[PDB]
Amino acid sequence: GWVWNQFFVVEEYTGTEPLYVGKIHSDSDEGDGTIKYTISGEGAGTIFLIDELTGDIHATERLDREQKTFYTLRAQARDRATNRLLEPESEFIIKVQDINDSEPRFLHGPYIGSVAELSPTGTSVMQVMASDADDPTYGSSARLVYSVLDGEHHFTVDPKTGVIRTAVPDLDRESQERYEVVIQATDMAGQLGGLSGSTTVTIVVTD
Amino acid sequence: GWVWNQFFVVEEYTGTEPLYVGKIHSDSDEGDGTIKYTISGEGAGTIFLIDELTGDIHATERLDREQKTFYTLRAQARDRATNRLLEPESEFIIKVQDINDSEPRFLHGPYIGSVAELSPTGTSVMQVMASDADDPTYGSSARLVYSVLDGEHHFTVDPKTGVIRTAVPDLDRESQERYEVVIQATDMAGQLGGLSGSTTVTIVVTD
Ligand SMILES: [Ca+2]
Ligand SMILES: [Ca+2]
Numbered sequence: 001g002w003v004w005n006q007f008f009v010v011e012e013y014t015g016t017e018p019l020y021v022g023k024i025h026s027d028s029d030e031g032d033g034t035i036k037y038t039i040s041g042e043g044a045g046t047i048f049l050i051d052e053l054t055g056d057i058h059a060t061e062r063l064d065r066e067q068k069t070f071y072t073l074r075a076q077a078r079d080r081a082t083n084r085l086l087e088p089e090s091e092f093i094i095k096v097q098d099i100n101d102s103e104p105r106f107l108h109g110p111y112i113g114s115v116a117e118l119s120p121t122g123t124s125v126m127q128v129m130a131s132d133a134d135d136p137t138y139g140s141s142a143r144l145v146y147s148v149l150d151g152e153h154h155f156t157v158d159p160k161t162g163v164i165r166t167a168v169p170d171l172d173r174e175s176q177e178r179y180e181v182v183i184q185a186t187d188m189a190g191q192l193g194g195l196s197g198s199t200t201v202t203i204v205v206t207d
Numbered sequence: 208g209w210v211w212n213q214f215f216v217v218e219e220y221t222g223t224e225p226l227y228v229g230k231i232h233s234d235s236d237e238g239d240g241t242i243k244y245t246i247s248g249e250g251a252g253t254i255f256l257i258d259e260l261t262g263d264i265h266a267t268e269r270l271d272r273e274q275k276t277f278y279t280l281r282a283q284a285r286d287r288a289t290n291r292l293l294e295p296e297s298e299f300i301i302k303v304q305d306i307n308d309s310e311p312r313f314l315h316g317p318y319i320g321s322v323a324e325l326s327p328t329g330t331s332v333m334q335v336m337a338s339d340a341d342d343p344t345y346g347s348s349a350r351l352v353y354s355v356l357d358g359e360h361h362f363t364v365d366p367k368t369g370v371i372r373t374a375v376p377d378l379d380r381e382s383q384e385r386y387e388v389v390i391q392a393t394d395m396a397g398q399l400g401g402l403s404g405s406t407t408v409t410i411v412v413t414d
């Protein structure tokens with residue numbers, strides 16, 4: 001069947017006034033105040049507070065999807081005069097939504113490789129893989145694009161794979177044996193506003 | 208029973224990235240892509256757009272609660288190869304939540320009242336009622352507070368009922384027969400950041 005028992009909440013909420021999660025409600029509620037809505041479970045009475053009359057739920061402190069992706073709660077509908085149930089206690093999930101708040105990070109450094117001297121232009125040297133803690137299944141918050149600096153005219157980098165390639169063929173080891181190239185990974189598919197990380201890759205020329 | 212088939216969307220959203228409304232989903236979804244989620248009804252395919260792969264719904268334009276408070280839609284789950292649905296098309300509502308973006312306005316103004324000369328201090332003259340197009344059932348966005356301007360020491364106004372009253376007992380008609388008093392209604396229960404409107408009330412001293 002269709003899945004409806006859910007609420008969505010943005011993570012890392014910036015406002016002062018509590019964030020509105022939603023509203024649990026019973027189709028028996030005629031709108032007179034005889035029903036008492038109460039919640040329980042993860043974050044109940046701490047993170048999420050409910051208005052026992054209206055059913056409105058609010059988040060009182062910010063949420064982090066990289067820490068916890070969903071909260072499982074239960075909802076009860078009491079009679080305000082007798083505190084007895086008018087609806088079965090029902091599980092409902094609060095899904096916290098991803099935002100691009102995780103920068104790309106090169107976690108496997110120091111990155112060092114080697115390539116033979118006088119190699120052809122386009123020779124695969126090594127590969128670097130940055131990581132992004134955001135949600136890859138929703139939006140480009142974790143879709144990365146690798147690049148070099150504009151003032152780097154010895155090597156290039158594939159944009160989406162991050163494999164380093166030589167940009168010049170006349171690399172004689174005697175003139176200069178060691179190069180330090182910086183690589184940049186940017187999320188949001190490289191569009192402006194995308195977060196970025198960087199690493200220093202040392203590449204050394206062999207015979 | 209519990210009402211769950213709903214999504215909540217804040218009105219007057221100004222940002223660039225489309226707003227996330229929610230996600231329709233079938234527990235029959237094995238997560239392989241053989242499912243085609245589609246939307247119909249109010250705002251379907253124009254205001255609200257859906258991702259057929261995941262089911263995520265987005266709002267493509269700013270919403271206005273004072274224009275429309277909720278949108279009634281239908282959700283379908285088709286098979287990607289046969290276009291025969293595996294769940295009955297289910298109605299679901301997108302309720303747009305209120306923000307304090309409507310100023311108080313005196314719509315039955317500007318009218319006129321009377322008070323007998325030499326009346327005691329605190330004599331009820333008349334009542335003024337401002338209106339607020341925001342949601343009165345949620346927040347103080349429509350809870351108003353009436354007030355006078357600084358340096359108005361002839362009449363007062365109750366902050367909650369808005370009934371004007373004499374502030375002085377020495378109202379001699381011969382000395383001054385007519386007063387133009389300004390009344391101001393402010394929402395958010397008067398707290399800073401509350402919107403305001405005003406009207407000019409002519410009060411006249413009688414015998
Ligand atoms: Ca986070
Ligand atoms: Ca990111």
Ligand SMILES: [Ca+2]
Binds near residue numbers: 065098133134135
């Ligand atoms: Ca994130």
Ligand SMILES: [Ca+2]
Binds near residue numbers: 218219272
């Ligand atoms: Ca509006």
Ligand SMILES: [Ca+2]
Binds near residue numbers: 311402
């Ligand atoms: Ca208002």
Ligand SMILES: [Ca+2]
Binds near residue numbers: 273308309340342
């Ligand atoms: Ca409003």
